[PDB]
Amino acid sequence: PREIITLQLGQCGNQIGFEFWKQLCAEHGISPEGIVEEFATEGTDRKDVFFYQADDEHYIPRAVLLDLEPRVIHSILNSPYANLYNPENIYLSEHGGGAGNNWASGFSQGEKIHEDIFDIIDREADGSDSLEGFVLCHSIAGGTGSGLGSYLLERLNDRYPKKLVQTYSVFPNQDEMSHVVVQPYNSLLTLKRLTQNADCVVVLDNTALNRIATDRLHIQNPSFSQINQLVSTIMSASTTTLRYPGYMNNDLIGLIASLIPTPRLHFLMTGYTPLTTDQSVASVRKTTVLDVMRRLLQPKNVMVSTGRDRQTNHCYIAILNIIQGEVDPTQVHKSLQRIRERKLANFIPWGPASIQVALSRKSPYLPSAHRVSGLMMANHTNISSLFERTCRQYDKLRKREAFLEQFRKEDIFKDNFDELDNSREIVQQLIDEYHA
Amino acid sequence: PREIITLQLGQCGNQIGFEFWKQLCAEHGISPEGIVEEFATEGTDRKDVFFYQADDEHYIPRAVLLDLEPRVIHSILNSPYANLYNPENIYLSEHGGGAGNNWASGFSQGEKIHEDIFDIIDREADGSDSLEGFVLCHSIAGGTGSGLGSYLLERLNDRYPKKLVQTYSVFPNQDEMSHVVVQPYNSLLTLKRLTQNADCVVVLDNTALNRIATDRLHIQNPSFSQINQLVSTIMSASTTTLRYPGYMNNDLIGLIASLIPTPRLHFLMTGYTPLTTDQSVASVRKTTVLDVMRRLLQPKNVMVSTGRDRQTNHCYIAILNIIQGEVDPTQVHKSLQRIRERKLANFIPWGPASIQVALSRKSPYLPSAHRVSGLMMANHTNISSLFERTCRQYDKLRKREAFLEQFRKEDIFKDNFDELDNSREIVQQLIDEYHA
Amino acid sequence: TPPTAVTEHDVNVAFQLSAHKVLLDDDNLLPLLNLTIREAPTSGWAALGLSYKVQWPLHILFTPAVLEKYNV
Amino acid sequence: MYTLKKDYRLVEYLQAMRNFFLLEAGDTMYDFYTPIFDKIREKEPWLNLSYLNVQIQEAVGQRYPDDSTRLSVSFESVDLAKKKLPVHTLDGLILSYKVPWPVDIVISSECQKIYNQVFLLLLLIKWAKYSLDVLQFNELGNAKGQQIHRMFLLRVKLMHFVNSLHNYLMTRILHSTGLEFQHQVEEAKDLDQLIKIHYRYLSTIHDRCLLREKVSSVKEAIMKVLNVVLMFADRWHAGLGAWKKESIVKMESDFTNCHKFLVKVLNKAVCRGSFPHLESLALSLMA
């Protein structure tokens, strides 16, 4: 019916998808090894849209996880949520990889394991006779998720041409350049494949993570154990129309169709306010829906590093405001009434704009059926500031003679560096041209 | 009427048939030395189909047990189930055999005890004037069950030509080759007799036993005391239409006739899910028949070592799905409704396929009249992978000069090794040719 | 096609198998209705309907007039 | 019903005659049939009233279920009436179950006369399915050639149709009636209502088995398949020669041509309502 195959790949893409499947059992009322609660069918009306359909009421995840590093998968099998995963769909015990840290490693390893990489991931494709598409849950940081992920964006474009492609990709961190220095090279090589060899992306910045991780979360030493908490909730938040029973844009080709203006303009800004557990003691007094979307357009919950004074000459075109759970829908048109009076979104002068609001009932659970949740999927034309940030860090590195002799020994014979530079400037010029 | 004589033979064939008769008394409500329960006639409507018919309400087993090793029979008489066996039908006290470990030992011992081996086993033949047939409950492992069992497949083919032959033969283990090394020789010599001198077999792999013996059974040191538990239940499961009162395919020539496509293609895949005792506490809530056959075609309960990626070019032709006991037959056509939608069985493109389901009431017993049981008798054309495994281990051993001088001193004067090789490849070529 | 009288039964058993592969949470909620469709105007769409008949005394809340008002 | 349960054995008389000639029992009616069918295979007369009346004596005493063996000694269903015709058109065997008083007020002679004719067709695909069973065990009756595998291409097209026409069709008409007859036994209170639920029971047994005391297309689809089985078994009681295997694939191409011809007739008989022929078409599409 609407079966999606997630493509978890890389050192960071496997960990953000590990707790994504772990989030799904707590809201479906199911255990990874059994069914102890009856809340799975009376409370939740649809479960076989991301999981594989049941053979013994055991909803297998439709997931594949490949990585060169064996460290990310050795921290999985000792956890009690790995018995839900199957040891025959992806790998058996003692799976390995390369050495290995290179973008050209996984780019060259795709055609030497070409027979095996297109054998076991295609067995899940013909399980349903109407496949939705493929989401590449991969990474941009490092050479593991960026090297091999650029290969599958090409060969799955023609072997599966009538399928939706759209990824939840995480952006790397640009604070210092000591541990990694190959960051401007492997990022722009995948970013070219994300626009012409891929339809849509969902950007997730790393410098904007610790802006939120010290905002309300109150940590002193930033660890990697907090990167899975902001990411796994908004992943399950994006499929609330798709997993839980909704009516309009209840498919993944429903939501993405109403937000993309044009190809190579698909970078969607994400926002999510409620992350604090001591808000729970004051939501008993009928906290309404009239105050939760006034702060979405206000740049506080954003996960995109952008300029603060560059929003006057940029214009919103498509903005999504997803409320979940208890909505009190007699005032949801009242919340959309107050949008035109502030004009917090700059509107495009050539065409109409749209503020789309939708709702779906959440899990039968006490932290879910009590507190209001707001998921934002914006589309603003100030996203070229990240593309100006990455390009200015790209041409400055090529004048310092950095990784021009250390990178072209394997499988690179011609200069494909300006092939990425002009196509990035094509994106940056057509964005500002789009508001005439 | 429908009397079958079981031919228990060999070191492993005698132990798997010892608890097969021990399983039958617990379900007939009878004791091996007396009749203490009245549940034998009101609950069970037919008992004289594997047992000999009664003279004092003592249902004698129609069994013969010959082996060269006296160790398997000395662990029988101290058990309290041996008084049901007779000390005049097969042997009296202190029966012996050879030394002895050779395929040529029992092959040469068949014509020196030719007068006695065709004297006392024929006394049970004329007890009923309409004999069903002969099942050779023998072994392939070792030289004891494989050496003498190949002789009776020839001389009973013409002396009893109008009788059904079909065996529940166990396959040997191919993990290491240190204790036994004669395993590729004695197996292929009997496997030729199982196709042209025998109509049907029921394969039982040894490397697939410990796949199940550590799956749900949770053992650390694999012993031989677990090999009789998976085998004795599916033996009595295969005769539930024959022992208990059924209507269609209630004979052994009923079941085998509806599954064999052609001679030399008779290797049937077996499956049996319920083997766990803590499932009993949750079968009180009307566990249905709609979920028990979704996992039979799913390769989890199989007892055949086969390839996982070789099922796309292979096609099922005949599949049997036997439910037992409480069936709730108002939804058994509902279970067969869901078969065509998944197409978990690949169908032959030249002719029709068949998913046959049947039911029979189980024993009047509390672990039997409460928990659903599913017996599978499949027939899939991926069974040549075992024949490719045995043949590749056969021609590799003949190039190492192994057992060519140590095997042809007794009763072997010509090279009959390629007589087994071409006939095995005839089976492997006609299987792939069978789907045009 | 232009509609014919056998297309009523064919679209019916198609809605059967469609709601059945979905795995509704109630198997008997599925055959509680059938579907009905005009004679042959131009096309089958915008000429089809639904019959969900109703049991004991709930039918006094649902007269056979107003199920056409829901079906239209 | 207090007196019709403890004084008399009214429903036990009913379930015994359902075991007699609706074949809910075990191998009682099987072990009747295969001596008769082995007698057919050697061209010896099974009509022969007298020895046929004793092969059905040995049937009703088989399996010892204590609802029919005591009816074999007294109030026997053994008495069989035969009609012999030199024209050999509408030949008919008529078996009758002896039914006692006051059960005979419920069970009329015309009641068992139509429970007779459903056995005439139930034994007949029991004659047709088990012909394809033992002949498969007979295993290539000869034991340019090489036409045996192309013979096997269209043999199991018809071997499997007859095996599934008596497996899945029967197990849906035996369970659905046996579960709805047990409903009417759970209600059962008085004599005038027990007669009506038994008369509506046979008319269900009618509509279950095929339908139509008059002419329809489903009997023609039955009797065509019957001539396929008759030409099948007559072919295999001989050796296979050089051109004899060419006549098998010539007949079997025609036999699947009329089998597919009568499938496309069966779709029209299914979209004209809701029927147990809907289940027979769902069997035949899965075939």
Side-chain angles (χ1 to χ4, degrees):
Chain A
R2 295 298 149 204
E3 304 316 289
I4 322 185
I5 307 300
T6 174
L7 251 70
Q8 294 157 246
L9 215 155
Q11 45 177 352
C12 290
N14 288 153
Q15 275 179 77
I16 65 175
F18 163 69
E19 287 184 14
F20 160 69
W21 289 111
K22 196 183 69 182
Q23 172 59 233
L24 270 155
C25 12
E27 55 183 350
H28 277 308
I30 59 170
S31 172
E33 93 296 311
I35 310 295
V36 324
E37 289 296 327
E38 53 72 28
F39 288 147
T41 144
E42 283 99 314
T44 302
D45 270 331
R46 166 159 189 82
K47 293 172 289 187
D48 37 9
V49 73
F50 262 110
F51 291 107
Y52 181 62
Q53 323 199 357
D55 12 270
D56 59 282
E57 315 215 351
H58 202 304
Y59 298 108
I60 316 188
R62 291 168 162 268
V64 283
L65 281 86
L66 275 300
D67 195 21
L68 274 78
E69 306 172 36
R71 187 234 66 91
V72 283
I73 61 173
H74 289 166
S75 188
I76 287 176
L77 74 159
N78 326 70
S79 135
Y81 295 92
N83 47 8
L84 156 80
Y85 291 91
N86 289 8
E88 79 281 349
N89 291 344
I90 316 163
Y91 48 84
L92 320 71
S93 227
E94 199 59 72
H95 192 244
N101 187 268
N102 220 342
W103 181 88
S105 50
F107 197 63
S108 62
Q109 278 195 45
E111 306 82 1
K112 67 180 220 187
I113 326 170
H114 170 73
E115 171 150 1
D116 203 78
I117 204 179
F118 284 161
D119 199 58
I120 202 60
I121 74 167
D122 277 352
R123 198 190 64 84
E124 217 64 48
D126 48 47
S128 152
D129 298 321
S130 56
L131 191 71
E132 177 85 1
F134 296 122
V135 47
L136 285 87
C137 225
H138 73 93
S139 208
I140 310 296
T144 49
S146 185
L148 198 145
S150 305
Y151 174 63
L152 296 155
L153 286 164
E154 300 169 310
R155 293 307 300 169
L156 297 167
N157 206 357
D158 49 355
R159 289 173 72 255
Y160 292 93
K162 277 161 176 114
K163 283 64 176 190
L164 175 71
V165 84
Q166 173 218 348
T167 171
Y168 305 96
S169 277
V170 285
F171 277 170
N173 171 260
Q174 284 169 333
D175 284 340
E176 311 92 305
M177 203 73 100
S178 59
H179 168 213
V180 95
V181 74
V182 74
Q183 191 184 348
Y185 279 108
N186 48 19
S187 54
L188 201 52
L189 271 158
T190 318
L191 275 186
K192 188 196 181 61
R193 311 299 199 273
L194 281 184
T195 72
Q196 48 184 82
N197 279 327
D199 163 70
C200 189
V201 306
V202 175
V203 299
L204 284 164
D205 206 83
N206 221 340
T207 48
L209 272 157
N210 322 311
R211 187 179 288 182
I212 310 173
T214 80
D215 207 302
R216 296 143 77 198
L217 256 172
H218 301 93
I219 62 169
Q220 235 39 34
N221 169 277
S223 56
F224 195 72
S225 54
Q226 282 62 249
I227 211 168
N228 348 61
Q229 288 159 5
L230 204 123
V231 163
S232 49
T233 72
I234 58 171
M235 278 162 89
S236 75
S238 50
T239 172
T240 52
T241 51
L242 174 73
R243 163 191 58 236
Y244 296 135
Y247 182 44
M248 284 302 182
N249 297 322
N250 74 280
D251 300 332
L252 204 81
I253 53 159
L255 297 159
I256 306 303
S258 195
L259 300 166
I260 287 189
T262 198
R264 90 176 46 99
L265 181 51
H266 48 85
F267 320 98
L268 300 161
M269 271 176 64
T270 317
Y272 199 84
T273 60
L275 297 157
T276 305
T277 54
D278 341 87
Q279 196 267 356
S280 50
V281 304
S283 62
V284 286
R285 58 167 190 87
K286 174 48 189 143
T287 315
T288 183
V289 76
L290 294 172
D291 70 319
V292 296
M293 67 164 66
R294 304 182 309 175
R295 67 181 72 101
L296 302 184
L297 253 55
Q298 174 175 15
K300 187 64 214 85
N301 54 359
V302 301
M303 335 180 172
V304 159
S305 28
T306 172
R308 282 309 167 256
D309 52 39
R310 315 185 73 254
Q311 292 195 37
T312 149
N313 319 337
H314 292 129
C315 296
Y316 284 84
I317 175 162
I319 169 69
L320 209 76
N321 303 83
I322 298 302
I323 198 89
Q324 329 204 354
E326 195 268 322
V327 24
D328 200 35
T330 190
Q331 323 188 89
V332 64
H333 81 104
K334 194 155 186 49
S335 294
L336 188 67
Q337 175 68 293
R338 315 161 74 188
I339 299 297
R340 56 181 181 179
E341 305 302 320
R342 298 296 178 187
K343 319 153 181 147
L344 273 147
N346 284 327
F347 312 110
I348 39 170
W350 61 275
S354 65
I355 308 106
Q356 274 192 15
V357 47
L359 55 98
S360 49
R361 47 189 72 100
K362 277 191 76 68
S363 162
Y365 197 31
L366 169 146
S368 72
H370 213 121
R371 286 92 204 175
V372 282
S373 206
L375 176 80
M376 190 172 56
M377 208 93 81
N379 202 358
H380 197 35
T381 58
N382 64 339
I383 47 179
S384 292
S385 58
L386 279 163
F387 301 136
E388 281 184 273
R389 186 180 183 182
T390 46
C391 179
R392 279 176 297 186
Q393 288 180 262
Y394 183 71
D395 56 358
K396 194 163 74 186
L397 193 72
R398 79 187 306 167
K399 304 178 217 204
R400 282 177 287 199
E401 285 306 315
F403 275 5
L404 286 156
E405 176 46 11
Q406 284 69 18
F407 198 52
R408 292 178 50 195
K409 316 187 281 284
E410 284 81 44
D411 84 346
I412 293 178
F413 307 139
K414 61 181 199 282
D415 299 336
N416 44 287
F417 310 121
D418 304 52
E419 268 86 344
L420 321 168
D421 210 34
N422 188 351
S423 57
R424 186 84 277 168
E425 292 279 71
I426 280 172
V427 172
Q428 293 178 45
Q429 284 318 294
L430 286 184
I431 278 171
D432 291 331
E433 180 172 1
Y434 210 73
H435 56 278
Chain B
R2 295 298 149 204
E3 304 316 289
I4 321 185
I5 307 300
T6 173
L7 251 70
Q8 294 157 246
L9 215 155
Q11 45 177 352
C12 290
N14 288 153
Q15 275 179 77
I16 65 175
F18 163 69
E19 287 183 14
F20 160 69
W21 289 111
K22 196 183 69 182
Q23 172 59 233
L24 270 155
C25 12
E27 55 183 350
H28 277 308
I30 59 170
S31 172
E33 93 296 311
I35 310 295
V36 324
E37 290 296 327
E38 54 72 28
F39 288 147
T41 144
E42 283 99 314
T44 302
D45 270 331
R46 166 159 189 82
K47 293 172 289 187
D48 37 9
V49 73
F50 262 110
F51 291 107
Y52 181 62
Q53 323 199 357
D55 12 270
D56 59 282
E57 315 215 351
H58 202 304
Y59 298 108
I60 316 188
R62 291 168 162 268
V64 283
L65 281 86
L66 275 300
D67 195 21
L68 274 78
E69 306 172 36
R71 187 234 66 91
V72 283
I73 61 173
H74 289 166
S75 188
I76 287 176
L77 74 159
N78 326 70
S79 135
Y81 295 92
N83 47 8
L84 156 80
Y85 291 91
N86 289 8
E88 79 281 349
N89 291 344
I90 316 163
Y91 48 84
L92 320 71
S93 227
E94 199 59 72
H95 192 244
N101 187 267
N102 220 343
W103 181 88
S105 50
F107 197 63
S108 62
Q109 278 195 45
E111 306 82 1
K112 67 180 220 187
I113 326 170
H114 170 73
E115 171 150 1
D116 203 78
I117 204 179
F118 284 161
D119 199 58
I120 202 60
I121 74 167
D122 277 352
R123 198 190 64 84
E124 217 64 49
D126 48 47
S128 152
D129 298 321
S130 56
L131 191 71
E132 177 85 1
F134 296 122
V135 48
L136 285 87
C137 225
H138 73 93
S139 208
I140 310 296
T144 49
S146 185
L148 198 145
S150 305
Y151 174 63
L152 296 155
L153 286 164
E154 300 169 310
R155 293 307 300 169
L156 297 167
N157 206 357
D158 49 355
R159 290 173 72 255
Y160 292 93
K162 277 161 176 114
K163 283 65 176 190
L164 175 71
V165 84
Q166 173 218 348
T167 171
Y168 305 96
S169 277
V170 285
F171 277 170
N173 171 260
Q174 284 169 333
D175 284 340
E176 311 92 305
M177 203 73 100
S178 59
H179 168 213
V180 95
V181 74
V182 74
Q183 191 184 348
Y185 279 108
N186 48 19
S187 54
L188 201 52
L189 271 158
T190 318
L191 275 186
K192 188 196 181 61
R193 311 299 199 273
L194 281 184
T195 72
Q196 48 184 82
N197 280 327
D199 163 70
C200 189
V201 306
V202 175
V203 299
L204 284 164
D205 206 83
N206 221 340
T207 48
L209 272 157
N210 322 311
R211 187 179 288 182
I212 310 173
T214 80
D215 207 302
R216 296 143 77 198
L217 256 172
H218 301 93
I219 62 169
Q220 235 39 34
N221 169 277
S223 56
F224 195 72
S225 54
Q226 282 62 249
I227 211 168
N228 348 61
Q229 288 159 5
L230 204 123
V231 163
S232 49
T233 72
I234 58 171
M235 278 162 89
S236 75
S238 50
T239 172
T240 52
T241 52
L242 174 73
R243 164 191 58 236
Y244 296 135
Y247 182 44
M248 284 303 182
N249 297 322
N250 74 280
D251 300 332
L252 204 81
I253 53 159
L255 297 159
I256 306 303
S258 195
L259 300 166
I260 287 189
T262 198
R264 90 176 46 99
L265 181 51
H266 48 85
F267 320 98
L268 300 161
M269 271 176 64
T270 317
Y272 199 84
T273 60
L275 297 157
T276 305
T277 54
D278 342 86
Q279 196 267 356
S280 50
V281 304
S283 62
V284 286
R285 58 167 190 87
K286 174 48 189 143
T287 315
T288 183
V289 76
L290 294 172
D291 70 319
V292 296
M293 67 164 66
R294 304 182 309 175
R295 67 181 72 101
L296 302 184
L297 253 55
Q298 174 175 14
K300 187 64 214 85
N301 54 359
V302 301
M303 335 180 172
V304 159
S305 28
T306 172
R308 282 309 167 256
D309 52 39
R310 315 185 73 254
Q311 292 195 37
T312 149
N313 319 337
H314 293 129
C315 296
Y316 284 84
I317 175 162
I319 169 69
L320 209 76
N321 303 83
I322 298 302
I323 198 89
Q324 329 204 354
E326 195 268 322
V327 24
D328 200 35
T330 190
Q331 323 188 89
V332 64
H333 81 104
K334 194 155 186 49
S335 294
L336 188 67
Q337 175 68 293
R338 315 161 74 188
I339 299 297
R340 56 180 181 179
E341 305 302 320
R342 298 296 178 188
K343 319 153 181 147
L344 273 147
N346 284 327
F347 312 110
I348 39 170
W350 61 275
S354 65
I355 308 106
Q356 274 191 15
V357 47
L359 55 97
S360 49
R361 47 189 72 100
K362 277 191 76 68
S363 162
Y365 197 31
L366 168 146
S368 72
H370 213 121
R371 286 92 204 175
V372 282
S373 206
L375 176 80
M376 190 172 56
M377 208 93 81
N379 202 358
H380 197 35
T381 58
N382 64 339
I383 47 179
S384 292
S385 58
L386 279 163
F387 301 136
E388 281 184 273
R389 186 180 183 182
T390 46
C391 179
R392 279 176 297 186
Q393 288 180 262
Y394 183 71
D395 56 358
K396 194 163 74 186
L397 193 72
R398 79 187 306 167
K399 304 178 217 204
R400 282 177 287 199
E401 285 306 315
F403 275 5
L404 286 156
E405 176 46 11
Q406 284 69 18
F407 198 52
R408 292 178 50 195
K409 316 187 281 284
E410 284 81 44
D411 84 346
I412 293 178
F413 307 139
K414 61 181 199 282
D415 299 336
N416 44 287
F417 310 121
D418 304 52
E419 268 86 344
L420 321 168
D421 210 34
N422 188 351
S423 57
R424 186 84 277 168
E425 292 279 71
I426 280 172
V427 172
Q428 293 178 45
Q429 284 318 294
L430 286 185
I431 278 171
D432 291 331
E433 180 172 1
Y434 210 73
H435 56 278
Chain C
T1 75
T4 175
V6 66
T7 321
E8 316 187 4
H9 192 276
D10 181 21
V11 157
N12 269 27
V13 71
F15 183 62
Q16 203 263 8
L17 59 89
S18 73
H20 185 123
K21 58 102 183 180
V22 156
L23 275 75
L24 198 47
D25 317 276
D26 194 25
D27 36 5
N28 58 88
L29 200 148
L30 180 158
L32 279 189
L33 59 94
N34 54 3
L35 303 159
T36 44
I37 178 168
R38 222 182 167 270
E39 297 201 74
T42 40
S43 156
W45 294 108
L48 74 162
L50 190 145
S51 202
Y52 178 74
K53 65 181 182 66
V54 79
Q55 299 174 0
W56 195 46
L58 307 155
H59 53 62
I60 203 68
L61 293 176
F62 308 111
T63 176
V66 303
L67 292 289
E68 185 76 0
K69 284 57 182 186
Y70 302 142
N71 200 26
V72 66
Chain D
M1 280 301 115
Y2 195 71
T3 52
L4 271 303
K5 174 65 188 67
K6 302 205 204 174
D7 183 279
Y8 291 110
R9 223 184 53 185
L10 181 66
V11 69
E12 287 57 56
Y13 303 135
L14 306 174
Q15 63 202 77
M17 62 81 75
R18 287 147 39 109
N19 288 306
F20 283 147
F21 43 72
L22 173 54
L23 307 99
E24 199 183 12
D27 48 45
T28 66
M29 299 304 307
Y30 170 77
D31 191 76
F32 166 62
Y33 161 70
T34 42
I36 303 306
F37 181 71
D38 290 348
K39 187 164 286 277
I40 291 160
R41 276 205 67 178
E42 61 198 54
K43 310 304 287 197
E44 210 272 338
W46 65 99
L47 203 52
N48 190 22
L49 184 52
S50 308
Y51 176 83
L52 163 58
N53 291 161
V54 179
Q55 288 301 302
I56 203 72
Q57 269 161 18
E58 292 180 355
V60 292
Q62 207 50 58
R63 285 256 192 179
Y64 309 105
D66 201 65
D67 43 9
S68 46
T69 52
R70 291 311 94 80
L71 289 186
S72 76
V73 191
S74 161
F75 321 123
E76 62 261 26
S77 177
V78 187
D79 47 348
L80 171 75
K82 53 156 196 202
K83 307 301 157 291
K84 307 189 124 181
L85 280 84
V87 188
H88 296 283
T89 314
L90 58 89
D91 70 314
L93 60 93
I94 302 98
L95 70 166
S96 172
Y97 163 81
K98 174 57 188 50
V99 71
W101 195 90
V103 188
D104 56 359
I105 314 170
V106 177
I107 305 300
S108 69
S109 67
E110 298 95 26
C111 285
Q112 70 180 15
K113 192 191 68 181
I114 309 308
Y115 279 58
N116 205 305
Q117 66 93 13
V118 66
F119 177 79
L120 201 73
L121 300 192
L122 274 174
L123 193 66
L124 172 142
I125 307 177
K126 188 153 154 160
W127 174 90
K129 183 182 83 75
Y130 289 147
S131 52
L132 269 292
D133 195 298
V134 188
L135 206 52
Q136 191 71 272
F137 174 61
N138 201 19
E139 194 42 65
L140 210 61
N142 52 15
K144 201 254 168 175
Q146 198 44 269
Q147 275 75 236
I148 47 173
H149 295 301
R150 305 295 156 260
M151 164 276 294
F152 278 132
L153 293 197
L154 305 159
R155 157 169 187 152
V156 186
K157 295 212 187 184
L158 300 161
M159 190 270 279
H160 152 70
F161 178 71
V162 181
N163 289 20
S164 60
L165 173 74
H166 213 177
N167 201 333
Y168 181 45
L169 185 148
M170 178 284 312
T171 194
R172 202 54 262 175
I173 67 176
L174 192 139
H175 294 353
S176 273
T177 54
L179 267 294
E180 77 191 278
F181 179 72
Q182 193 35 67
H183 173 285
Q184 299 300 331
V185 167
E186 283 145 27
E187 177 270 352
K189 281 308 292 277
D190 43 356
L191 170 74
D192 275 15
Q193 189 266 349
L194 265 290
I195 290 170
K196 166 60 57 177
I197 59 192
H198 197 266
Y199 183 73
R200 210 197 48 76
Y201 185 54
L202 53 88
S203 301
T204 293
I205 295 287
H206 276 118
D207 173 57
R208 289 318 288 177
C209 60
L210 68 171
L211 201 42
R212 302 305 187 200
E213 295 291 322
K214 56 177 295 174
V215 167
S216 75
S217 282
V218 67
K219 50 199 58 56
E220 166 57 51
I222 288 297
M223 61 84 71
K224 191 56 166 275
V225 162
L226 269 47
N227 301 335
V228 182
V229 170
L230 271 156
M231 186 49 219
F232 194 87
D234 189 47
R235 173 74 278 156
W236 284 101
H237 300 347
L240 304 187
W243 77 281
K244 311 299 280 167
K245 295 187 283 294
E246 304 190 77
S247 46
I248 303 173
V249 306
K250 171 62 174 63
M251 281 277 179
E252 282 177 344
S253 69
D254 285 13
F255 288 152
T256 62
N257 184 63
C258 50
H259 169 238
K260 190 149 180 176
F261 188 44
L262 272 301
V263 159
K264 297 191 181 184
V265 175
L266 196 48
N267 62 26
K268 185 202 57 52
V270 158
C271 51
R272 59 181 183 192
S274 184
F275 290 114
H277 315 88
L278 265 63
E279 186 262 337
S280 290
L281 191 66
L283 168 51
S284 78
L285 70 85
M286 286 164 182

